[PDB]
Design an enzyme around this catalytic site. Structure first.
Site, PDB file in Angstrom:
ATOM      1  N   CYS A 110      -2.229   0.394  -2.854  1.00  0.00           N
ATOM      2  CA  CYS A 110      -2.893   1.555  -3.497  1.00  0.00           C
ATOM      3  C   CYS A 110      -3.786   0.647  -4.808  1.00  0.00           C
ATOM      4  CB  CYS A 110      -1.952   2.474  -4.114  1.00  0.00           C
ATOM      5  SG  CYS A 110      -0.650   2.799  -2.959  1.00  0.00           S
TER       6      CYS A 110
ATOM      7  N   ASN B  62      -2.452   0.361  -8.549  1.00  0.00           N
ATOM      8  CA  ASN B  62      -1.563   1.216  -9.114  1.00  0.00           C
ATOM      9  C   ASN B  62      -0.372   0.618  -9.572  1.00  0.00           C
ATOM     10  OD1 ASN B  62      -0.444   1.131  -6.291  1.00  0.00           O
ATOM     11  ND2 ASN B  62       1.058   2.711  -7.321  1.00  0.00           N
TER      12      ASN B  62
ATOM     13  N   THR C  63       2.891   1.070  -9.106  1.00  0.00           N
ATOM     14  CA  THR C  63       3.877   0.680  -8.210  1.00  0.00           C
ATOM     15  C   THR C  63       3.583  -0.179  -6.806  1.00  0.00           C
ATOM     16  OG1 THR C  63       3.278   3.032  -7.769  1.00  0.00           O
ATOM     17  CG2 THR C  63       5.775   2.390  -7.919  1.00  0.00           C
ATOM     18  N   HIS C  64       2.223  -0.663  -6.953  1.00  0.00           N
ATOM     19  CA  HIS C  64       1.708  -1.612  -5.882  1.00  0.00           C
ATOM     20  C   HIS C  64       2.536  -2.744  -5.958  1.00  0.00           C
ATOM     21  CE1 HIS C  64      -0.441  -4.274  -3.952  1.00  0.00           C
ATOM     22  NE2 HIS C  64      -1.308  -3.483  -3.428  1.00  0.00           N
TER      23      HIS C  64
ATOM     24  N   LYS D 137     -34.861 -19.121  -1.601  1.00  0.00           N
ATOM     25  CA  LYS D 137     -33.737 -19.796  -1.193  1.00  0.00           C
ATOM     26  C   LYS D 137     -32.361 -18.810  -1.111  1.00  0.00           C
ATOM     27  CE  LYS D 137     -34.551 -24.278  -2.365  1.00  0.00           C
ATOM     28  NZ  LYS D 137     -34.352 -25.712  -2.314  1.00  0.00           N
TER      29      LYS D 137
ATOM     30  N   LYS E  37     -21.987 -40.127  -1.262  1.00  0.00           N
ATOM     31  CA  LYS E  37     -21.283 -39.018  -1.202  1.00  0.00           C
ATOM     32  C   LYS E  37     -19.909 -38.985   0.053  1.00  0.00           C
ATOM     33  CE  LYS E  37     -24.804 -37.516  -2.903  1.00  0.00           C
ATOM     34  NZ  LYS E  37     -25.896 -36.687  -2.366  1.00  0.00           N
TER      35      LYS E  37
ATOM     36  N   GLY F 254      -5.919   4.200  -1.085  1.00  0.00           N
ATOM     37  CA  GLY F 254      -5.203   3.344  -0.260  1.00  0.00           C
ATOM     38  C   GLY F 254      -5.414   3.637   1.171  1.00  0.00           C
ATOM     39  N   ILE F 255      -4.690   2.529   1.845  1.00  0.00           N
ATOM     40  CA  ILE F 255      -4.576   2.192   3.652  1.00  0.00           C
ATOM     41  C   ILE F 255      -3.324   1.790   3.639  1.00  0.00           C
ATOM     42  CG2 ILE F 255      -7.164   1.896   3.529  1.00  0.00           C
ATOM     43  CD1 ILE F 255      -6.483  -1.275   3.714  1.00  0.00           C
TER      44      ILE F 255
ATOM     45  N   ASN G 129      -0.346  -3.739   1.370  1.00  0.00           N
ATOM     46  CA  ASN G 129      -0.861  -2.537   1.530  1.00  0.00           C
ATOM     47  C   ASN G 129       0.089  -1.347   0.757  1.00  0.00           C
ATOM     48  OD1 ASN G 129       1.437  -1.871   2.762  1.00  0.00           O
ATOM     49  ND2 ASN G 129       0.634  -0.800   4.713  1.00  0.00           N
TER      50      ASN G 129
END
Ligand SMILES: [Ca+2]
Ligand SMILES: [Ca+2]
Length: 427
Positions: free
Chosen positions: A1, A76, A78-79, A274, A376, A406-407, A427
DNA sequence: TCTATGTCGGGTGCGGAGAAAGAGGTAATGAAAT
DNA sequence: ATTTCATTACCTCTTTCTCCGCACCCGACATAGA
């Protein structure tokens, strides 16, 4: 979330705003494989600010000095943060009210403001009277009770606070290299010109590299330091290979030129100036690395003083950013320094100079080995080298009770995807 | 009349080495909770 | 009687920041193609 606008890293490699993810699309799994979405949790709640910590100091003193892009997200309360923490043990010796010891980071429990009993790490002491092999044993054990040198566990924002003081600092999050692999560099080439194959996409990439650094902004031509023969040679050899011909010097590559039909086709030059195109961040790794070698041979010096690294410069933001992600997709660590647009009495006008820094030992060495520069190049890593997710420390600041987007990932997956920024989230 | 590639002049980018600031790791040290 | 914790001062490790000028670049224009 998370928070509305938080950029995610779609599975196909793209990038979308969380606030658009539709049930049935695929986000980017940390291992490079798709994560199917099914639930789209929405609602409001108190948010939280998560931003990486960096020894950046400039802005604090002077204002209008550009704020550093720095890895962050807003989730959030609670995440669940996907954190990590070292397994440590130190033998401290002490004297209390009159009269050894073994302190360790252990997997434990602790009471929350609510009834909630959260799992997490805590510092654990255990010592006997000075009045030998104990404290030793009391340690050897801890050292032989695992391979992992860290604990991989999760914890919700709102609970970080319950974390100890020692542990709380030792605790960091991560961002995984982009292992996904597109072939937009490959399909392009074959999707065009009467090419010669077998190393085609390679030498191409290397040249595409050089050019960015030392290459005129209107044609497939570029400078090279005459003194560096290896380089001198690499262009020659490589030029030949692509089926083209050859203080400081400008070298032109004449055969209707492939290179140009690349600096254009893949958009290395965007409407005049560029720019390291995005796609590159998610194409055959190798290709990526090569393209880096070039850019490193061209413009970027290397040192081993404090462990291998390479600093690149530049003033076009396009290149800046582009390089940043690319190096970041390779699992190299990278920080950006910006120099002000100072104007001097020696009568000169200087613009804002960006200096991109990169490190990562073995991961980098694998790039530098593909370089030609006399100064180099660095021999490739002996055996297999880590391409493990990189860790970072962070600040967490309480926030406004706002909306969240969320998801939720398939009821059968690691439940961890990559945010556009490449930071691993639950998630 | 309209696209590449010699080549020429004013001025800026960034080349190059370090030292020093921060970050967390280590230990030290005192007072309270268990 | 240990074991819990914060905090502080110092050590280790990397990474931010700076300092300054001259040679390498960008910008332009002419010219050959077409
Ligand atoms: Ca350059
Ligand atoms: Ca250069």
């Amino acid at each position: 979330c998370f928070a509305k606008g938080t950029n995610v890293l779609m599975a196909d490699g793209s990038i979308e705003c969380i606030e658009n993810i539709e049930v049935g699309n695929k986000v980017m799994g940390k291992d490079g494989r798709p994560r199917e979405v099914i639930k789209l949790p929405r609602g409001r709640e108190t948010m939280y600010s998560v931003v990486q910590k960096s020894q950046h100091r400039a802005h604090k003193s002077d204002s209008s000095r550009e704020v550093p892009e720095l890895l962050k997200f807003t989730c959030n309360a609670t995440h669940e943060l996907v954190v990590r923490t070292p397994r440590s043990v130190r033998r401290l010796s002490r004297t209390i009210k009159g009269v050894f010891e073994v302190i360790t980071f252990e997997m434990g429990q602790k009471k929350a403001p609510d009834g909630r009993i959260v799992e997490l790490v805590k510092e654990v002491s255990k010592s006997y009277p000075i009045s030998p092999e104990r404290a030793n044993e009391l340690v050897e054990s801890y050292r032989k009770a695992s391979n992992k040198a860290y604990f991989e566990w999760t914890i919700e924002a709102r609970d970080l606070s319950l974390l100890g003081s020692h542990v709380r600092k030792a605790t960091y999050q991560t961002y995984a290299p982009i292992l996904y692999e597109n072939d937009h560099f490959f399909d392009y080439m074959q999707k065009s010109k009467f090419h010669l194959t077998i190393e085609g996409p390679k030498v191409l990439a290397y040249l595409l590299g050089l050019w960015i650094g030392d290459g005129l902004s209107d044609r497939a031509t570029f400078s090279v330091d005459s003194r560096d023969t290896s380089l001198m040679e690499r262009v020659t050899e490589y030029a030949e290979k692509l089926n083209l011909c050859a203080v400081a010097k400008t070298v032109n590559l004449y055969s209707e030129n492939p290179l140009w039909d690349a600096i254009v086709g893949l958009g290395f030059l965007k409407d005049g100036v560029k720019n390291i195109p995005s796609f590159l961040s998610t194409d055959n790794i190798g290709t990526r690395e090569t393209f880096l070698a070039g850019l490193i041979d061209s413009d970027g010096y290397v040192t081993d003083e404090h462990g291998i690294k390479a600093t690149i410069k530049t003033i076009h933001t396009s290149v800046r950013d582009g390089l940043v992600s690319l190096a970041r997709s390779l699992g190299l660590v990278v920080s950006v320094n910006a120099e002000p647009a100072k104007v001097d009495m020696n009568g000169t006008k200087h613009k804002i100079s960006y200096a991109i820094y990169m490190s990562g030992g073995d991961v980098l060495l694998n790039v530098l080995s593909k370089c030609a520069g006399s100064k180099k190049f660095r021999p490739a890593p002996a055996a297999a080298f880590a391409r493990e997710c990189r860790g970072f420390y962070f600040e967490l600041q309480e926030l406004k009770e706002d909306d969240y987007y969320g998801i939720t990932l398939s009821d059968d997956s690691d439940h961890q995807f990559l945010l556009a920024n490449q930071v691993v989230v639950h998630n």
